[PDB]
Amino acid sequence: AWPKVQPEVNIGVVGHVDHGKTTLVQAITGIWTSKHSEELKRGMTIKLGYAETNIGVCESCKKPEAYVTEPSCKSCGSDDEPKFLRRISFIDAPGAEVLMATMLSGAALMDGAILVVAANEPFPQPQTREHFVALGIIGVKNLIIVQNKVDVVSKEEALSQYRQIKQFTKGTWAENVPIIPVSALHKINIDSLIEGIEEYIKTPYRDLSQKPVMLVIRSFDVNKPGTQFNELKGGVIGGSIIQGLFKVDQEIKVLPGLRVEKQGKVSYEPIFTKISSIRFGDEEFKEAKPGGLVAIGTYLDPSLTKADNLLGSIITLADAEVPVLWNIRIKYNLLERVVGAKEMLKVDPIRAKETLMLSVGSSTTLGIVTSVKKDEIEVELRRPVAVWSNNIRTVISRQIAGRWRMIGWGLVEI
Ligand SMILES: Nc1nc2c(ncn2[C@@H]2O[C@H](COP(=O)(O)OP(=O)(O)O)[C@@H](O)[C@H]2O)c(=O)[nH]1
Ligand SMILES: Nc1nc2c(ncn2[C@@H]2O[C@H](COP(=O)(O)OP(=O)(O)O)[C@@H](O)[C@H]2O)c(=O)[nH]1
Ligand SMILES: [Mg+2]
Structure with missing residues (x-):
């Protein structure tokens, strides 16, 4: 079996609208990141999307097919269990031009990124350019460029665009970034992309002794109808730990906190609470480190956290300055x-x-x-x-x- 651990790295997925970002995350992880009503109706990412997957390698098989996302090597003809490498996660950004701010908020969480470029659209499209510039500004330099939708263009056209992409990165920080052709829709050459992720988007060094800080990007009420009158929970806050670590039962605070009135003036009051639970995806843990998006259970009234109320906040230990x-x-x-x-x-x-x-x-x-x-x-x-x-x-x-x-x-x- 493979261990159950938290993701240890955050990989952004960026690029122009409809170039295949969300479909690419689905090709790798099996997960469709869009969960909001409006997203499903419009067929587009609006809020930051998220998905996780284990990565392993079949030591008896040849690369890239040796790279797998499940504990089997049957696909490359081996009955051995693949060696577990790591669990990774993806931050799926909106490419809509009106949603750049959301992309930027997601970029703050990225350890590296995939820039998705549709092979059947003129290059470079506005948000191909804009997301590329944003990565450079923010310092997300561990980049892979993916040439998507190669299933609907000729070899000639794909090669022509390949040369234009290399010329676009020439003389920039991204000069040596690899370009990997795939079809996200038909799951072609996804194994080469997984290999590329292992090679070019390594897990970065973390500092676990720095004061714990989590950046908040989600918050919600996890209570559902049809549940026993006392199985219900406090508010949950979701985000990325960027330094240090958090543990269950720790005293924490949310900053700037809650908008309140104080002496006739608008004020922000730090929100103090305790960690009741720690969850990555569908698994519970006793502590959380950088990597992945974590769900922090609290003892807060769920009206404080509902509907992404705390987006943009940070969480630190109660006593942190x-x-x-x-x-x-x-x-x-x-x-x-x-x-x-x-x-x-x-x-x-x-x-x-x-x-x-x-x-x-x-x-x-x-x-x-x-x-x-x-x-x-x-x-x-x-x-x-x-x-x-x-x-x-x-x-x-x-x-x-x-x-x-x-x-x-x-x-x-x-
Ligand atoms: N032919 C082809 N179509 C694709 C591929 N990947 C995505 N698409 C289509 O492109 C459209 C937008 O994909 P989506 O994942 O929503 O792209 P996003 O807006 O960048 O997140 C959908 O109709 C997809 O089915 C591909 O590899 N080949
Ligand atoms: N820490 C913690 N996280 C939880 C708990 N229940 C659900 N979550 C997380 O909350 C997120 C969304 O919950 P889900 O039931 O899937 O959707 P939602 O309730 O409609 O927001 C998921 O990432 C879960 O891992 C809990 O009891 N404790
Ligand atoms: Mg999308």
């Missing part, structure tokens, strides 16, 4: 052009009194620029952000032609 800031100072840089538009325009300099969008960890916040300098802006936010470390990455977006567009990036200066 973490800045929660209404005003932030950012050492910034601007992109030269707006890459996400069909027509790429120049980026105008930041001006005082502009309303900008700030992506910090899993959080997304609007604020007003109160100050602009050469290297530095100060922003008054519509709600505070938890800044758990010095020099955290922020991505800056501006509303251009009715759409929020990434225009720069920086470090939050504390």
